[PDB]
UniProtKB/Swiss-Prot annotation:
This is Non-structural protein 3. Changing Y117 to V/W: Almost complete loss of mono-ADP-ribosylhydrolase activity. It comes from the Viruses. ADP-D-ribose binds at D13, N27, G35, G115, V116, Y117. Residues 4-163 form the Macro domain. It comes from Chikungunya virus (strain S27-African prototype). Seems to be essential for minus-strand RNAs and subgenomic 26S mRNAs synthesis. Displays mono-ADP-ribosylhydrolase activity. ADP-ribosylation is a post-translational modification that controls various processes of the host cell and the virus probably needs to revert it for optimal viral replication. Binds proteins of G3BP family and sequesters them into the viral RNA replication complexes thereby inhibiting the formation of host stress granules on viral mRNAs.
Amino acid sequence: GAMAPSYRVKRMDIAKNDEECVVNAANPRGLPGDGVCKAVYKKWPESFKNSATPVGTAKTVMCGTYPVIHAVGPNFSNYTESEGDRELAAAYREVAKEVTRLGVNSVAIPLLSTGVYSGGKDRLTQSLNHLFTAMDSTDADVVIYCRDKEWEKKISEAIQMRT
Ligand SMILES: Cc1cn[nH]c1-c1ccncc1
Ligand SMILES: [Cl-]
Ligand SMILES: [Cl-]
């Protein structure tokens, strides 16, 4: 575990993270995809061997000894708000199981279902709160990665609010 487990936020490419493992915002079919998933494919392509997994699940594949945790959030274009919310919560619970199993002291994590799976809605708060629900009981240092300047401020404020 980390000596004083923390949450932090950085605005940069998650493919340049400084953590012991990464969470991919994966598609269910293990395809290169776009956004976070395409950056992860360019950086760790070996991790896409048998990475296909259903919505609401996470599957880890090693690139050398570096763990890539493929987490499949729901596409809110296809799911109801209610069913999508349940699957988004579930994907983050499976990420917490994998992080714990791997014994890492730190993890780089994007906000699941906030980009092309958002169904055109702002889901910063919904996605971040499910991340916290899952990860609060883990003792890894969590570093959240984003690309928007206004999102960085709002994520930083939400972390600071809990102190
Ligand atoms: C969060 C986000 C949205 N569009 N692209 C990204 C991104 C891309 C690569 N690495 C990390 C994040
Ligand atoms: Cl997304
Ligand atoms: Cl962002």
